[PDB]
Structure 1
Amino acid sequence: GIGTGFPFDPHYVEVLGERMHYVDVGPRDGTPVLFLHGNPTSSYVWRNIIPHVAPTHRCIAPDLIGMGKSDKPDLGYFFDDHVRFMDAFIEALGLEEVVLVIHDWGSALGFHWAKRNPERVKGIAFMEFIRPIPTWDEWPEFARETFQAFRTTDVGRKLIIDHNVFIEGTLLMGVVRPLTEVEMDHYREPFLNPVDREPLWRFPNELPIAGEPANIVALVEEYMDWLHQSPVPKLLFWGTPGVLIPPAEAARLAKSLPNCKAVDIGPGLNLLQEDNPDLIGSEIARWLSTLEI
């Protein structure tokens, strides 16, 4: 069965005066592979994928600020806050050239960093990633009223902050197979106190949907314009029915994006890592062996 443990040695680095936790396994040299999680996860989401890559490549998986085992400063946890901390995390580790493996809000971080620093990105593997959702009709109908409610300071904070709905409900509605109690306890651990749930609420309020927020829509449009032209090697994982990326969106991206290979993982919603980790890990490792890294 799918692994529930998190065996990785903890590593911590000071970033802008705060401690960030990260996984760091595999060989010390070579080009490192940087894994970026999203909402409401942590490096735990990569726990069954990294073991396929670590035999041949260094794997670095940070917990975003305010998440996982990273510190919890009193921030708004806007996307811009995550950009500042992730930019500084990369520099604090002395990383030069990297391969990115990115998902959900980790994909917005990774694509935005890659567009700004294309000389340092030797490949991008991505899945269920952030793109502009032009209208609410392009958000999945089964989740539409709830994401609209999440994007308010009254109803949305009651759901996400007071009642932890992004962890207890949305997370499960983002995985096809059932999560176990042990897995749920790993996902719950950073958010036992309601006040620590700010990033879980700010993230859906940053999603670029129906033109709002305009600043995020613009930033995401910019990195998508880059991705449609850049020769950077690309590996796209997708599932059915998906959430952010429906199968039809995925198949077209695969042929439109330069130097891109697409991989169908089977049934999947948002956290594709929880539905088919072994295929995602083995395909990343195979694809890495084809790169000039």
Structure 2
Amino acid sequence: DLADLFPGFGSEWINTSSGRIFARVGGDGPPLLLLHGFPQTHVMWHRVAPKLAERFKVIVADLPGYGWSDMPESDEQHTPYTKRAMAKQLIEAMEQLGHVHFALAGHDRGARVSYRLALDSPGRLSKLAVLDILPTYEYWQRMNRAYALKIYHWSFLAQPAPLPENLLGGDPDFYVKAKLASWTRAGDLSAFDPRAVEHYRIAFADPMRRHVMCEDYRAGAYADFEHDKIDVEAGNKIPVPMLALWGASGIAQSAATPLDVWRKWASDVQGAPIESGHFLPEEAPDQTAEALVRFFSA
């Protein structure tokens, strides 16, 4: 079956009004919520989370609809898979554990939940880290020929159902491995623990999990963009101290210099590149863990 990649961590199914959140929980200390993105699950943190668990109570959650979390039924506006809704559902989940103020690090889609959480509900966060993203608004505003070729999946996966779902279902293994490999520094699967790849492949093998991922990308092209547009045009900035980490060969640094962009969105932001492709916690786990431990311990 599927390997346990978090030796010593407990497992929790947290009930919320939108379905259960699955999480691994370990460590002790101030609470720290870790959110994955696409096409992964909470196991992508397995190389970094033990180092964090030395200092923090580490909650490694599957996003709503991902991994082993429940999949709320979507609707015409992709509501449960908007980052606004995911953020609210994770706030509820954390409250079930007694965590009403916590630290948060997210990667990829999870990072988008994270900065939206900080915009909507900043009082819930002590500190925020985002890994290898710019805000959704900024990717769309910078969508020229070169970038449309680089992140074509932003507009492919956002096509109306069931178009991407039907194409993905012919050979799901190929696509999940293709995306994992294409966004790494090396362009192959060598950075990943094969036991982790199996987790990602098995999640992607479920047609309803694939649909959820497309709903996430549809939200990303519509409501998420519109929520971000409101904030940027209103000049609303994230007031929580934040860390922006990005991969020197990752996605965010394509088509913008990341710290300059985040300075427009956040009043107190620091950042650093890491020699890595998109998948910082797996491609560069020691470097990522150190940056996060330093930031959240300050």
TM-score (norm 1): 0.82
**Equivalence for 1:96:** 100
Contact 1:150 1:159 in 2 (8 A): no
Contact 1:33 1:58 in 2 (8 A): yes
Contact 2:115 2:130 in 1 (8 A): no
**Equivalence for 1:259:** 268
TM-score (norm 2): 0.81
**Equivalence for 1:167:** 176
- 1:46-85 aligned at under 5 Å gives the runs 46-75=45-74, 78-79=81-82, 82-85=86-89
- Decide which moves more: 188-197 or 277-286: 188-197
Q: In the alignment, residue 40 of structure 2 is paired with which amino acid?
A: T
**Equivalence for 1:278:** 286
Q: In the alignment, residue 189 of structure 1 is paired with which amino acid?
A: I
Structure 2 portions without partners, runs of 5+: none
- Decide which moves more: 102-111 or 219-228: 219-228
- Which whole-Å CA distance do the structure 2 matches of 1:169 and 1:47 have between them? 21
Contact 2:259 2:270 in 1 (8 A): no
- 1:171-250 aligned at under 5 Å gives the runs 171-177=180-186, 178-179=188-189, 180=192, 181-208=194-221, 213=222, 215-222=223-230, 229-246=237-254, 248-250=256-258
Q: In the alignment, residue 172 of structure 1 is paired with which amino acid?
A: A
Determine what percentage of the aligned residue pairs are the same residue: 21
CA, structure 1 residues 53+101, in 2 after alignment: closer, same or farther (shift >3 Å)? same
CA, structure 1 residues 197+255, in 2 after alignment: closer, same or farther (shift >3 Å)? closer
Alignment size in residue pairs = 280
Q: In the alignment, residue 201 of structure 1 is paired with which amino acid?
A: C
**Equivalence for 2:128:** 124
Q: In the alignment, residue 197 of structure 1 is paired with which amino acid?
A: R
- Which whole-Å CA distance do the structure 1 matches of 2:94 and 2:274 have between them? 30
CA, structure 1 residues 138+218, in 2 after alignment: closer, same or farther (shift >3 Å)? farther
- Which whole-Å CA distance do the structure 1 matches of 2:283 and 2:10 have between them? 25
- Which whole-Å CA distance do the structure 2 matches of 1:51 and 1:83 have between them? 24
Contact 2:247 2:273 in 1 (8 A): yes
| SS of aligned partner of 1:171 | helix
- Which whole-Å CA distance do the structure 2 matches of 1:108 and 1:199 have between them? 16
- Which whole-Å CA distance do the structure 1 matches of 2:220 and 2:237 have between them? 23
| SS of aligned partner of 1:219 | helix
| SS of aligned partner of 1:15 | coil
Output one character per residue of 1:62-86: Cα deviation in whole Å (capped at 9) or x when no partner: 1122222223454455326534532
RMSD between superposed Cα atoms in Å: 2.9
